[PDB]
RNA sequence: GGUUCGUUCCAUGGAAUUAACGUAAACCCUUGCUUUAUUUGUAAAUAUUAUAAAGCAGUUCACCUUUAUAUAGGAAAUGAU
């Protein structure tokens, strides 16, 4: 909730998990390189066992939002998650209903 | 009583050239310099692709802006002034009759007339010149701040603010796991 | 010497000579290749793809911006219309109707197209137009009548200041202030009308629509004579028409494919297929040895070396009075043209460029409505009417046999399908319309 | 706050509300209710030039403004809409209401907009024949020639540029040496 | 559309939101028959 | 007061109705390798002979265009947004592209074919070019001395950036431009 | 080696250096010291400069043997100059000056003054003529921009009788009924 | 009533004449061929794999059979292609 801005900054298809994956984006691109240090403390076998148990207690306490894999793509349209294509951004079925009334470039019926 | 007389062919001779348009004039003009701007910022040994890449450098301090000397010269003074006034961030003209547009359509708003010495230098520094940081050599492994600025050093992806945040809490963790 | 490097790329020369083969198999005449920008709606390549997946989106909002620019009138307060007050929302259909818009995007810059109906300009024009020619006329005595009196003594000079100027220019307003108000009324209402299409209000917009592209936006906002050439502003005005809630859904159909005209046309000559037979005309024909070297070298004809001479047997020169042979030229601020482009006559010209383009002629119109459109404000079954006048097949290749292009891999270049949502007092409903090309 | 209300409260006052002559306008000027002192003579030696005029000219005047009336009297009528009227059948703005008599008529003078993407396509390729032909000549005069590279020129550097776009390959430099 | 009104109410013209302009038309008559949302409660239940 | 009859039109307009004459190169080395893209056909056909005239005037041998391997991304998605999977349907976007390859060519009148290019691209197009150039050894020597050649072609070019005296918004200049292409580009 | 064949030269009898020669100096003759003056009386001297610089950058050799017809589909239909632009079939030209943010509509104060100086302006050559208030009601600008002439951004309209088009319409509609 | 892959086509009916959609045609891949282009693909090369823009091509010609004389069909590794 603390990173929930307290003014909207979407301007695609809004949504509760919409807001709330938007938010997760945001937090995780300011504490990625402090991220990344704990991470590579873990994992440097040369420092004491007592810096890298250190750096595995504070990369426990993060907040879920700092975690990058709770990111997950979602469709700026319809604000779904399931069936996302990176590419576009959006469903297959939203892609499908865009790409035959031309309005994703380049896309075309494949037909061989 | 109610009649509307048709449109008389003086008037049609007149609606034409409106809307089809009349013979206007066109010069041919083509010179390096109506061409400079458009340009591939390539760091070659020929001048004209070094000029580029300094130019492209202050593109990317004026908001980014592709180059476009040929489509109007009106802007957006209100955001120009914000931005030149309240962020106190550079602004870039693709011409000096798109300066001069927002000159006189501000009440009495001033623009600098160039850069600043110290912005000149910091351009041609790393655009043209190259500057850089040679990343040292770390022979041995235990050396963890010396090996890390080694690879920070050498890859675009960490810029100047992104290696600080990490080097913060790296040196807080090395500090915080001695006797 | 020369660089042991430089003369590693000189050894890797295994490039395949040009030939000048000369045909010996009659060629077709190429397809009709349908023009590029109404396959997608963005016309863009970027090698970057962060710069194309929100284009999908983008669409949405600018259309929206420029629905709402278009729209854009004075406030009654400003030309003292005296608002009637009626909490009941007005539905006027004499405004400007635009179509979605079409994107040619550059690494430069961004060309917006969008096509627009004017009929707020068919009634402004005729309702100023009736005012009598006597006003300017008898307008203008009043200027030369006022400064005899009022900056004249006994019944621009250098004893005549500004200050006086004002007081003067008050009496005029204050005899003709309901005439003034009037003229004036319908003054700046056709030029609001107008200068949406010029620079005046179009830079405004640009800096909102820049603002998605990050490029400077050129309008090219084509003006429709009729509403029916274009399925985008057809569904609109028939939706606005269906809204309402006494509207009389089958009549308001018919009134439109009644104004919808057909050309005349032979069914049995529409219909009647092609026979493949060489074009000897053609150019690629004509000269199966394009090289100037044969075509020149006193082939047939002796003494029409002069290239010139060639191309204007083949193509239609405008700048040869005669039409052929002669290109006599005079020998020994104003705008730098040449001192004939007035004599040049774009006649057969126009009558090339327009024969060259398929798709011109209206021959095909459907209509089809569909959703909750009762009177009655009650639970009742779905309504759908279909109406159509003419056929929206490819002539060219479903009788005469010919090859055409279809765009996105499966849609006909010559039909343009455009649908409409709205929404009644029950429920929604939608309008998708059909416009097709001979 | 609170439930919405209407905002009625909106109305533009005209400055004149019945037609003034220069003599009655001028009596209501001078009438010293706002008004400078110095330019209060203005208007006073304005009103002494108006009553010295004959009769006859004032007449005239008064004649001239109602021959400007019946000028404007057919554009201020309130036009009737068609009994099956199509554009009007709702419209509250008295304003645009017109006979309607062949305003959706074909004149033959327009192409459906699959034509106006084809016409367009032939402006375009006129822009770049016009550019061809006064343009591109002018490139020779600041052309240079090839020279091939010396015997110190040993190094042969590649840069990539993707021509007015920013894409993240755009800072590699290859070199390659003998 | 808010931005729209903005740069260009300064040369005194007006443009209808019709999408905001329907989302009140439709409050309003959910009042009229007494349909409308509650007070807004903004204390705990008790 | 004469009427003089020309025999001729000018190059210039008869050399649009030939073929894109070409330079003929002597030694055959890449100086330059442009890759134009597009979704479509007549777009990258036309500006493929534009470009070629523009490389006759300025004396640079052109090689093409070279038809380059189409790229075809394939997406195969449900006709419908729910439990009906077993009708599907194919989608793709071919990638027509096409290569153009100068040889013996001056790096700096490269440049102005490349920058000729960019003033008058045509809509629809992408483009990519290789730009190859042979130098001397002690890089760092000659990037220094080329300074003060730089400053004056800038001199009357610096007109085009304007800001307060000490602009405080840009803070650290490296860091700005670092995070400002990003966000000129979109992520990357 | 070249970058040609000589097949198609060798047909025509052009084996010989010195006979190709002569089948451009007969053939692809430069302009005469005539022709030059009278071509450059014609066109102004912007026009000029690129037709002295086109003859002295396309060499007739090269004509010779390489000079093909073009035959492909994006070939212009018809020979013409292009040097000024068209009305119809060119693009809007934009020779106007640009707007002013700072300017409004005009009151009804400076729509009378705009008024009464165009019937100064009108009477400087009785009263307004049917060209005169024809100009007023859609060239007049009723801003206060000085009476600027913008530069629309409207694609040019087709001629009154589009080719292809005239001739096969019948109005269904009688304007008697 | 015939014929056709086919409401295809022909003939005919003391009632028919026509329009739209599907169908057909056309489209994309693939096949042979012509021209174009030769890099990042090709050993060389006078151009022949590959790459890919456009154009042509079929049941076309030959042979056999054939109703109401109107519309056609057959033969399938030993006619051409
Ligand atoms: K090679
Ligand atoms: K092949
Ligand atoms: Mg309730
Ligand atoms: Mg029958
Ligand atoms: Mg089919």
Redesign the interface.
Same mark, same amino acid.
């Given at each position: 909730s603390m990173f929930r801005a307290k003014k909207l900054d979407l301007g695609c298809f809004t949504n509760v998990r919409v807001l709330r994956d938007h938010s997760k984006r945001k937090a995780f691109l300011e504490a990625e390189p402090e991220r990344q240090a704990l991470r590579y403390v873990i994992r440097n076998t040369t420092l004491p066992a007592r810096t890298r148990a250190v750096a595995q207690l504070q990369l426990t306490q993060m907040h879920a939002y700092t975690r990058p894999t709770q990111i997950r793509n979602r469709c700026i349209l319809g604000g779904k998650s399931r069936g996302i294509l990176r590419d576009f951004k959006m469903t297959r079925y939203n892609f499908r209903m865009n790409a035959l009334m031309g309005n994703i470039p380049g896309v075309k019926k494949a037909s061989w | 009583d *109610?009649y509307?007389a048709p449109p008389?062919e003086?008037?049609?001779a007149?609606l034409?050239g409106?809307?089809?348009?009349?013979?206007?004039?066109?010069?041919?003009?083509?010179?390096?310099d109506?061409?400079?701007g458009?340009?591939?910022?390539? =760091?070659?040994?020929? =001048?004209?692709? +070094?000029?580029?890449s300094?130019?492209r450098?202050?593109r990317?301090?004026?908001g980014?802006?592709?180059?476009?000397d040929?489509?109007?010269?009106?802007? *957006?003074?209100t =955001?120009i002034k914000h931005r030149?006034?309240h962020?106190?961030?550079?602004?870039?003209?693709?011409s000096?009759?798109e300066?001069e547009?927002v000159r006189?359509?501000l009440?009495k708003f001033a623009?600098?007339?160039?850069?600043?010495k110290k912005? +000149?230098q910091?351009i041609?520094e790393?655009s043209?010149?190259?500057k850089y940081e040679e990343p040292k050599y770390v022979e041995s492994?235990?050396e963890?701040v010396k090996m890390?600025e080694k690879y920070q050093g050498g890859t675009?992806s960490?810029?100047?603010? *992104? =290696? *600080?945040?990490?080097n913060?809490?790296?040196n807080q963790?090395?500090a915080?796991?001695?006797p | 010497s020369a660089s042991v490097i430089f003369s590693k790329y000189i050894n890797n020369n295994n490039n395949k000579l040009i030939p000048f083969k000369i045909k010996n198999s009659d060629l077709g005449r190429t397809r009709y290749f349908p023009p590029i920008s109404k396959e997608w709606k963005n016309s863009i390549y970027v090698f970057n793809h962060n710069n194309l997946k929100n284009l999908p989106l983008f669409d949405i909002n600018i259309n929206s911006l420029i629905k709402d620019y278009f729209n854009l009138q004075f406030k009654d307060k400003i030309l003292f219309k005296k608002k009637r007050l009626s909490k009941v929302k007005v539905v006027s259909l004499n405004k400007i109707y635009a179509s979605k818009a079409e994107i040619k995007h550059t690494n430069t810059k961004a060309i917006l197209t969008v096509y627009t109906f004017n009929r707020e300009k068919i009634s402004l024009y005729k309702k100023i137009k009736k005012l009598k020619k006597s006003f300017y006329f008898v307008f203008d005595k009043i200027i030369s009548f006022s400064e005899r009196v009022i900056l004249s003594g006994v019944p621009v000079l250098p004893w005549i200041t500004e200050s006086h100027v004002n007081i003067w220019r008050k009496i005029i307003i204050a005899s003709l202030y309901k005439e003034l108000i009037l003229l004036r009324k319908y003054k700046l209402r056709l030029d609001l009308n107008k200068y949406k299409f010029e620079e005046k209000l179009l830079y405004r917009l640009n800096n909102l629509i820049m603002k998605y592209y990050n490029k400077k936006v050129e309008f090219n906002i084509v003006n429709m004579r009729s509403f029916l050439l274009n399925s985008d502003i057809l569904t609109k005005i028939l939706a606005l028409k269906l809204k309402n809630r006494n509207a009389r859904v089958i009549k308001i159909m018919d009134v439109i494919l009644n104004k919808a005209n057909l050309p005349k046309i032979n069914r049995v000559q529409e219909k009647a297929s092609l026979i493949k037979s060489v074009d000897w005309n053609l150019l690629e024909n004509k000269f199966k040895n394009l090289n100037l070297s044969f075509i020149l070298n006193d082939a047939s004809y002796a003494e029409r070396n002069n290239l010139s001479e060639l191309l204007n047997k083949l193509y239609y020169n405008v700048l040869l009075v005669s039409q052929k042979g002669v290109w006599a030229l005079r020998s020994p601020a104003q705008p730098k043209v040449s001192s004939f482009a007035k004599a040049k006559k774009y006649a057969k010209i126009y009558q090339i460029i327009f024969n060259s383009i398929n798709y011109k002629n209206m021959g095909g119109l459907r209509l089809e409505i569909k959703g909750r459109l009762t009177k009655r404000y009650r639970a009742d079954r779905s309504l759908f009417k279909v109406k159509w006048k003419g056929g929206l097949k490819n002539l060219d290749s479903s009788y005469k046999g010919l090859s055409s292009v279809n765009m996105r891999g499966y849609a006909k270049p010559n039909v343009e399908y455009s649908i409409f949502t709205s929404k009644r007092r029950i429920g929604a409903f939608a309008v998708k319309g059909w416009v097709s090309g001979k | 706050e609170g439930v919405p209300v209407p905002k009625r409260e909106d109305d533009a006052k005209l400055e004149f509300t019945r037609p003034y002559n220069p003599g009655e306008f001028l009596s209501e000027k001078l009438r010293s209710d706002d008004l400078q002192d110095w330019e209060r003579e203005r208007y006073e030696r304005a009103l002494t030039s108006w009553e010295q005029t004959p009769d006859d000219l004032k007449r005239g005047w008064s004649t001239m403004i109602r021959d400007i009336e019946q000028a404007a009297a057919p554009l201020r009528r309130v036009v009737m809409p068609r009994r099956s009227t199509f554009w009007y059948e709702e419209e509250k703005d008295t304003d645009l209401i017109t006979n309607e008599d062949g305003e959706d008529d074909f004149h033959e003078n327009d192409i459906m907009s699959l034509g106006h993407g084809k016409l367009e396509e032939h402006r375009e390729f006129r822009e770049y024949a016009r550019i061809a032909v006064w343009e591109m000549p002018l490139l020779s005069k600041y052309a240079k020639p090839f020279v091939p590279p010396t015997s110190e020129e040993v190094l042969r550097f590649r840069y990539t540029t993707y021509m007015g776009e920013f894409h993240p390959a755009d800072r590699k430099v290859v070199v390659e040496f003998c | 559309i808010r931005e729209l009104q903005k740069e260009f109410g300064t040369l005194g013209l007006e443009v209808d939101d019709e999408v905001d302009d329907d989302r009140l038309e439709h409050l309003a008559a959910l009042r009229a028959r007494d349909k409308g949302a509650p007070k807004k409660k903004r204390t705990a239940p008790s | 007061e004469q009427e003089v009859i020309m025999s001729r039109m000018p190059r210039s307009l008869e050399a649009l109705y030939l073929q894109p004459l070409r330079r003929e190169a002597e030694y055959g080395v890449p100086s330059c390798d442009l890759q134009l893209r597009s979704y479509s056909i007549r777009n990258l056909e036309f500006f493929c002979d534009f470009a070629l005239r523009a490389a006759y005037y300025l004396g640079l041998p052109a090689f093409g265009p070279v038809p380059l391997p189409r790229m075809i991304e394939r997406w195969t998605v449900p006709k419908s947004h729910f439990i009906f999977k077993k009708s599907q349907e194919n989608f793709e976007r071919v990638t027509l592209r096409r290569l153009i390859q100068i040889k013996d060519g001056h790096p700096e009148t490269v440049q102005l074919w490349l920058a000729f290019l960019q003033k008058h691209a045509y809509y629809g197009i992408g483009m990519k070019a290789n730009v190859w150039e042979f130098s001397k050894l002690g890089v760092s020597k000659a990037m220094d001395e080329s300074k003060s050649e730089v400053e004056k072609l800038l001199e009357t070019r610096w007109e085009h950036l304007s800001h307060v005296s000490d602009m405080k918004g840009v803070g650290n200049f490296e860091d700005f431009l670092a995070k400002e292409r990003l966000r000129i580009s979109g992520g990357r | 080696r070249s970058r040609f064949k000589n097949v198609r030269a060798v047909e025509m009898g052009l084996t010989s250096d010195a006979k190709i020669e002569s089948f451009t100096k007969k053939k692809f003759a430069e302009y005469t010291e005539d022709e030059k003056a009278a071509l450059a009386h014609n066109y102004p001297a912007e026009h000029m400069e690129a037709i002295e610089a086109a003859e002295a950058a396309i060499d007739p050799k090269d004509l010779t043997i390489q000079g093909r017809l073009r035959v492909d589909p994006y070939r212009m239909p018809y020979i013409d100059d292009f040097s000024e632009i068209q009305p119809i079939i060119d693009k809007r030209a934009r020779r106007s000056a640009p707007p002013s943010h700072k300017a409004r509509f005009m009151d009804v104060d400076e729509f009378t003054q705009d008024l009464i100086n165009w019937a100064d302006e009108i009477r400087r050559g009785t009263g307004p003529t049917d060209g005169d208030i024809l100009s007023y009601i859609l060239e007049r600008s009723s801003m206060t921009d000085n009476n600027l002439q913008a530069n629309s951004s409207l694609a040019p309209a087709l001629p009154d009788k589009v080719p292809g088009v005239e001739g096969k319409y019948r109005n269904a509609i009688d304007p008697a009924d």
């Open positions: - | *109610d509307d008389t003086e008037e049609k007149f034409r409106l809307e089809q348009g009349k013979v206007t004039e066109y010069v041919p003009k083509l010179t390096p109506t061409l400079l458009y340009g591939p910022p390539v =760091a070659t040994d020929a =001048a004209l692709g +070094k000029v580029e300094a130019m450098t202050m990317i301090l004026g980014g802006l592709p180059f476009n040929q489509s109007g010269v009106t802007s *957006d003074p =955001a030149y006034v962020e106190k961030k550079p602004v870039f003209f693709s000096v009759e300066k547009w006189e359509s009440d623009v600098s007339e160039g850069p600043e912005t +000149k910091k041609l790393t043209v010149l190259g492994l235990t963890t890390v675009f960490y810029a100047p603010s *992104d =290696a *600080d945040k990490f913060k809490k790296l963790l090395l915080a796991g001695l | - | - | - | - | -």
